[PDB]
Amino acid sequence: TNKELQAIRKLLMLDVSEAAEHIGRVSARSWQYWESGRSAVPDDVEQEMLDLASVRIEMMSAIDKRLADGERPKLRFYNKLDEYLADNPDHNVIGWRLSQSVAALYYTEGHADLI
Amino acid sequence: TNKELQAIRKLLMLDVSEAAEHIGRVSARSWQYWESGRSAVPDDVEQEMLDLASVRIEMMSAIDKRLADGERPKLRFYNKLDEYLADNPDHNVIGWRLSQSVAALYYTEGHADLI
């Protein structure tokens, strides 16, 4: 539904324009129409957003591994996209947002430091 | 630091303009300055952001209570601010975003449905 689509997008920290370009391959206006509720949300886009959410879960699982190993992780929080891309040259703006989503969660809940 | 400030802000699903107006009581430019890293984040702003994160934890704890009572919660995802305000007339735009952040988490991670 429109509500599930927006929920996942925001949890993954994607701006509408970023989700539209990279996941929907549609204009931002088209993506807004999907989230507005005045349109059918196509099921394929919803499925691709759930696939991307599984990437966030994989990234969380890796941090959980460090925690089980006794480490208090120091996670890079990239305020600047360009710095993320410099350190992660095989990723893009969507990877940057997923990194923010994961680092912010672990920090805010008291489980990791940000660097 | 600027990284912690932006991380909490984004996790709570607040736009810069919303955080600036209601939490900082400053302009978006000033809030962006605090998120830039150029100087230290003010003590009172830091504390208020931590306190709002605690409100989010309290909201999660209330849902955890319902799960422990055997409910499968149907959480209302408010894509429309005014609908949230009508249902929660003592709250404002910041409370709306907190509601989105909690509903999106429990939905995307499989514990609740959205309506």
Numbering used by the authors:
A (entry chain A), B (entry chain B): 2 to 116
Which text from the study accompanies this structure?
Bacteria are under constant threat of invasion by bacteriophages (phages) and other mobile genetic elements (MGEs). Among the many protection strategies employed against these invaders, the highly diverse CRISPR-Cas systems stand out as the only known adaptive immune systems in bacteria.
Here, we report the first structure of an Aca protein, the Aca2 DNA-binding transcriptional autorepressor from Pectobacterium carotovorum bacteriophage ZF40, determined to 1.34 Å. Aca2 presents a conserved N-terminal helix-turn-helix DNA-binding domain and a previously uncharacterized C-terminal dimerization domain. The elution volume during the final size exclusion chromatography run indicated that the 13.7 kDa Aca2 protein forms a dimer in solution, corroborating what was observed with our previous constructs. The Aca2 dimer structure shows each protomer stacked against one another in opposition, like the letter X, such that the HTH motifs are aligned along the “base” of the dimer. Examining a single protomer shows that the proposed NTD HTH and relative C-terminal domain (CTD) are in fact small clusters of secondary structure elements abutting and joined by a longer backbone α-helix, α4, such that the protomer forms a single globular protein. Whilst the NTD provides the HTH motif for DNA-binding, the CTD stabilizes the positioning of the NTD from the other protomer by stacking α6 against the other protomer α1, thereby aiding dimerization. The Aca2 protomer-protomer interface was analyzed using PDBsum, which calculated a buried surface area of 1213 Å2. This is supported by two salt bridges formed between R57 within α4 of protomer A and E110 within α6 of protomer B, and vice versa. Whilst the upper CTD surface of the dimer contains mixed patches of both electropositive and electronegative potential, the NTD HTH motif is clearly electropositive and primed for DNA binding (left). Dimerization positions the Aca2 recognition helices for insertion into the major grooves of target DNA, supporting its role in regulating anti-CRISPRs.
